[PDB]
Design a binder for this molecule. Structure first.
Ligand SMILES: Nc1ncnc2c1ncn2[C@@H]1O[C@H](COP(=O)(O)OP(=O)(O)OP(O)(O)=S)[C@@H](O)[C@H]1O
Ligand SMILES: Nc1ncnc2c1ncn2[C@@H]1O[C@H](COP(=O)(O)OP(=O)(O)OP(O)(O)=S)[C@@H](O)[C@H]1O
Ligand SMILES: Nc1ncnc2c1ncn2[C@@H]1O[C@H](COP(=O)(O)OP(=O)(O)OP(O)(O)=S)[C@@H](O)[C@H]1O
Lengths: 686, 686
């Protein structure tokens, strides 16, 4: 027992370990397990970073304070040491001799040690199950749920002797009570000051966007590491003193260079640099000496921090012994004086700590979490009126015409960012009708590039492939007997990879109606459960649906024809192909129009602009008359596609004779091109 | 104590560590990890040779300069001494005894000395875990990726003990700056001079051809071995001296035989050999003397290297301790003068160096890599445009005929590699018709064997197989839960293995127009989604499509008649059977004709080559009459299948009775065979 167990109550007796904060329902709960005659060995169940070892240790603090119930007193938690057990040796068989010897040793201690085990399922078990079953060994185990189920949930010793009690992770305010629990410990680790929006924003946003790990832990190493970064920033010499310091080192060692001067007559002219030397000396001693004043302020601050910690260790040892006159002479004696000189120190640091910032901001936590997640917290919390009001201009950068669409859609996005919508629905539910490549593709990449900040959030799934009855098994999930019964279909994998994404559904009318029913279910729910066996949320994505029934009616219906016509017979075609309660579950019915010749001209322009970039690579620009712009305007257009042969007319009239000529060497970089017209085409000239 | 530890800091103090170049950021991140109290122990995660130990030692250089922040002021780093554990460990158990005792007197140091351990996955050491749980020491680790992932991913304690730090393989340019750093160390240790394009081209070729190692280490080995080999040339006796040494030692053996003369008219002739001894000994003496002159001057400039480096060491320690008159003494004093007569020595080699060479150049680099890889210096001095011009000639070496294809397609490949169009396209997107066995895969393996230097970049696709809905399931992949998804798409298999491929397609019009549309997605964007759905990028890959619908008119338009008309009536029929989108996708509408009659004779003797090898292995030699060759040309040729029946017509017609005649003994080895013509059969004649 000298070799294999750590007395946790000893380190609690030195105050070497932190107090637990909160979670006394779990503590009392475990106390309600420890009382028990059989199942003397409880099983903690929880995730990493939860606090279960702190449950054990604060339980030991309740032991050493005697605040545990009577009879539970008299026994001492000495937890099983990791790596004292096997431990490390050349042979096999040592493991069982050590197991035996510690069982004889706890046998001769007569229960007065209660034995905690970290990670029960890893640490076999031959001599264990009898002494467990007798109840003589009053140990304690702790593991996770899933690794219990895979270590095993099943077998008779494990389910027999033990009692599983599981926990939750704490709530946001609960984590605030945690950080207000241990913030003094981290402050004397850190010697900084702490803002309250830093910790409530840390718990809230770390709660929201970190789905992997759990409370409290992600908040803990956010606050800890960020505060360490502030320690490194503070404890280094100030950057103005650094930028001065480099040229001042340069003049003081250039002074070393110019003491033994070669020409006292010819290089007597150096005395200007001797005067600048003295000026940099004066301003240098001023800036440095200001920083020494900061060092005196921060030094006295850390002293009254430390002496307040000594007052708290003293008052708590007075709680352990129960010396009440000692408690009064401490709490009236030391504490209010260090409180008032604390407030004088903090108001003085509110005054003169101009250059250095002991206070940490919520903005620091935003920067560190941006360095983990990748999203800037500017994008969370800039002027939301700036981005949300510039959104229309953002669209009319790369999506031309189509004002009604960007209005209704954009306002829907606005009230989505409001939070006024249902948290039991996906974000945006939209139907689009119109030609392809005229801006639909631009709309998807544009909007995912706006909110989801990249074009990658778009997921295209065509429904033209999905015709037969088996199409639902294709895109959703397979039946058994197949690997797709572990894989699922396309959609579940798509949102399964990208939680924050945009879903695109092309030519959606061709499918069987069995598709359309679960389409109604993802319209109602924002959830669906796959062949694999998991629920997949859609509360962080927007479904975008396109059909091509009345797209040969959408080329004509806008602008110049009535929406009641194509709405009547195409909603009638919905009545053939859906029920319009599905239309009740889409949010908007959005219609597009073909482009005016000015739009077509401008998308020819911005289509050329990337070629102007790639000639900016080589060293060229290009000037084009409205004649040749009418050639790309006429040849780049078709009624069936709109803008899709634009690249075709451009490459076929332009890219091949032009870069033909650069493969002839006829074109000199740094000499500008003007694409002047040919006979009836485009030709190139330097 | 003193026995059981290496201090790195006293080594960087005594210059025993190496200077580091350009890794500040991850050092800063490392300090940000090290300032924590828990999980404060970072793990360097990167490939071997990447710079991890150098990051450690350069951090110790910031220690020994005091450049560290005041959070890490005065803290110590001492490296592990495993060899002192086994020093004196006379019996088993004493190793772990000194391990724990050294762990104790380190454990009383308590954070002042911060340990580094490399190769942490190698580290028993379960006993080292609880002292880490106490934090009585402080550690830095360094291991690999999957070592970590099998290492502390399992131990939930150790993932709370540690933390990831990644170091990627750096820029080429900072690696050049690293060589700028230690180039004084390697020129001064290695006695020679090095130019900067040796560093630059060493980085370019070393980065290009060897990715198995990492930066910087491969370039370090190139420079180290390279310049050390130049110094081996300096050591080695020159070639005039050793050729003359051969001639004098033969002159001493032969003349010594002539000195012990017996014959009158034969051996009294020896005086001409004696004056030849006078000649070769004088010339050997003079070239010998000039070699001692070059070794004299080069020895002198080596001494000035040592003297100037002593000025560097003395000025650096002079800047450490701050000895003022020593800094003015050395800086104003030795280093300008030693640079003056240093330039007298480098100018002195600037004239006098005729016999030996000392400056490290790019030819030396190409030699040293040419002696590692065996890849010739011709390959490395090949520019892009060099093989772009050599494409016609080099493929005409293998593939004679089809000058349309090699010349025109060679122009097309120069256009694609040069930058004609949008880079989001496949490199080669054309149509290459022709019957089977007349040059198709011949030209495929020719192409990939030219531009990718191997035949293996090939996959062939049959559209006539692909008439169904499992077509797409075959070539690009079945959906999940379907047959063939285990095979996937064989296209996605070979392209997913080799991204630099050449794709063959066969008889395109027999397929379904889904594959014309999947095909149309291929010819656009330089990409495609597979049956799984993820993108398969095509911008590094040439596709080749045949159609056998011109088979008989291809085999008649083969010898003599121009093959442009095959291309154009191919545009007639194929334009009729297709849509003009796909027609505008392909750039050159090509068709592979069968070879000429004399070219058929060339193919025939090409197959005869290995046969004649087998013959002259045994002393045989077949001559062939051109007429019997012509009978093979009309016989083994198929107007349907080209010359595919020709090979089986060779073995089937002649070779089995040829085996009966060689094996008969009738045909005698050591004798010429001519393929004379006894009757309509071809029968060999001795
Ligand atoms: N409610 C809490 N009160 C105090 N500290 C807590 C609390 N929750 C978590 N912690 C801290 O979070 C860290 C991890 O919790 P632990 O006490 O080690 O238990 P754990 O998360 O279950 O880890 P285990 O038990 O080894 S799997 C410790 O530094 C705890 O002090
Ligand atoms: N910035 C640098 N300046 C100078 N030398 C460097 C630099 N980075 C890497 N090196 C060299 O690269 C060599 C190999 O890298 P290491 O520092 O050993 O880290 P490594 O990736 O762990 O290599 P190992 O030890 O073989 S696993 C070192 O010995 C240095 O000589
Ligand atoms: N242009 C050519 N030059 C020389 N030999 C050729 C040529 N074309 C075909 N051959 C011969 O015919 C054989 C088969 O033709 P290939 O070159 O492979 O064309 P193919 O379409 O792959 O026909 P296969 O291999 O039977 S599917 C080759 O192995 C050669 O022996």
């Amino acid at each position: 027992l000298k070799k294999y167990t750590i007395d946790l109550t000893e380190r609690a007796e030195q105050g070497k370990l932190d107090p637990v904060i909160g979670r006394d329902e779990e503590i009392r709960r475990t106390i309600q397990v420890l009382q028990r005659r059989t199942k003397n060995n409880p099983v903690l169940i929880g995730e990493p970073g939860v606090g279960k070892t702190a449950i054990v240790e604060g339980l030991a603090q309740r032991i050493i304070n005697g605040e545990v119930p009577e009879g539970l007193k008299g026994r001492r938690v000495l937890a099983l040491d990791m790596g004292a057990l096997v431990a490390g040796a050349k042979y096999r068989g040592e493991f069982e001799e050590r197991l035996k010897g510690v069982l004889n040793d706890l046998a001769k201690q007569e229960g007065n040690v209660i034995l905690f085990i970290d990670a029960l399922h890893t640490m076999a078990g031959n001599m264990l199950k009898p002494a467990l079953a007798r109840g003589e060994l009053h140990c304690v185990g702790a593991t996770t749920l899933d690794e219990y189920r895979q270590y095993i949930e099943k077998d008779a010793a494990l389910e027999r002797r033990f009692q599983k009690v599981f926990v939750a992770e704490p709530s946001v305010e609960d984590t605030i009570a945690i950080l207000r629990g241990l913030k003094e410990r981290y402050e004397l680790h850190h010697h900084v000051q702490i803002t309250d929006p830093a910790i409530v924003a840390a718990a809230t946003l770390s709660h929201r966007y970190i789905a992997d790990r759990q409370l409290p832990d992600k908040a803990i190493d956010l606050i800890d590491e960020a505060a360490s970064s502030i320690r490194m920033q503070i404890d280094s010499k100030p950057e103005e003193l650094d930028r001065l310091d480099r040229r001042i080192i340069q003049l003081k060692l250039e002074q070393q260079a110019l003491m033994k001067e070669s020409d006292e007559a010819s290089k007597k002219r150096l005395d200007m640099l001797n005067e600048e030397l003295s000026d940099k000396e004066r301003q240098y001693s001023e800036l440095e000496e200001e920083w020494k004043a900061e060092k005196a302020s921060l030094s006295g601050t850390q002293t009254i921090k430390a002496e307040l910690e000594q007052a708290k260790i003293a008052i708590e040892q007075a709680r352990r012994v129960g010396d009440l006159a000692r408690m009064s002479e401490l709490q009236y004696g030391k504490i209010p004086e260090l409180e008032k000189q604390l407030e004088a120190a903090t108001q003085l640091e509110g005054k003169t700590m101009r250059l250095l910032r002991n206070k940490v901001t919520d903005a620091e936590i935003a920067e560190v979490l941006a360095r983990w997640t990748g999203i800037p917290v500017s994008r969370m919390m800039e002027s939301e009126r700036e981005k949300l009001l510039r959104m229309e201009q953002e669209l009319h950068h790369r999506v031309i015409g189509q004002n009604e669409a960007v209005d209704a859609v954009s306002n829907a996005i606005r009230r989505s960012r409001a939070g006024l919508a249902d948290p039991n629905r996906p974000i945006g539910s939209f139907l689009f009708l119109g030609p392809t490549g005229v801006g639909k593709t631009e709309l998807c990449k544009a909007l995912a590039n706006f909110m989801f900040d990249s074009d990658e959030a778009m997921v295209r799934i065509d429904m033209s492939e999905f015709m037969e009855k088996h199409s639902v098994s294709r895109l959703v999930g397979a039946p058994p007997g197949y690997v797709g019964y572990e894989e699922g279909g396309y959609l579940t994998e798509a949102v399964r990879r990208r939680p924050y994404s945009v879903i695109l559904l092309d030519a959606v009318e061709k499918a069987h109606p069995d598709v359309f029913n679960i389409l109604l279910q993802v319209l109602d729910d924002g959830r669906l459960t796959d062949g694999q066996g998991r629920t997949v949320d859609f509360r962080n994505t927007v479904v975008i649906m396109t059909s091509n029934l009345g797209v040969r009616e959408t080329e004509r219906k806008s602008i110049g024809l009535i929406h009641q016509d194509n709405s009547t017979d195409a909603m009638e075609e919905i009545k053939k192909i859906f029920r319009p309660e599905f239309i009740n579950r889409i949010d908007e019915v959005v219609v597009f129009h073909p482009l005016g010749e000015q739009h077509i001209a401008s998308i020819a322009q911005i289509q050329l602009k990337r070629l102007y970039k790639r000639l900016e690579e080589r060293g060229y620009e290009i000037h084009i008359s409205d004649e040749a712009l009418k050639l790309l305007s006429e040849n780049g257009y078709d009624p069936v596609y709109g803008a899709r042969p634009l690249k075709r007319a451009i490459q076929q009239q332009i890219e091949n004779p032009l870069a033909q000529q650069i493969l002839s060497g006829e074109l000199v970089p740094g000499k500008v091109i003007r694409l002047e017209v040919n006979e009836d085409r485009i030709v190139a000239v330097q």
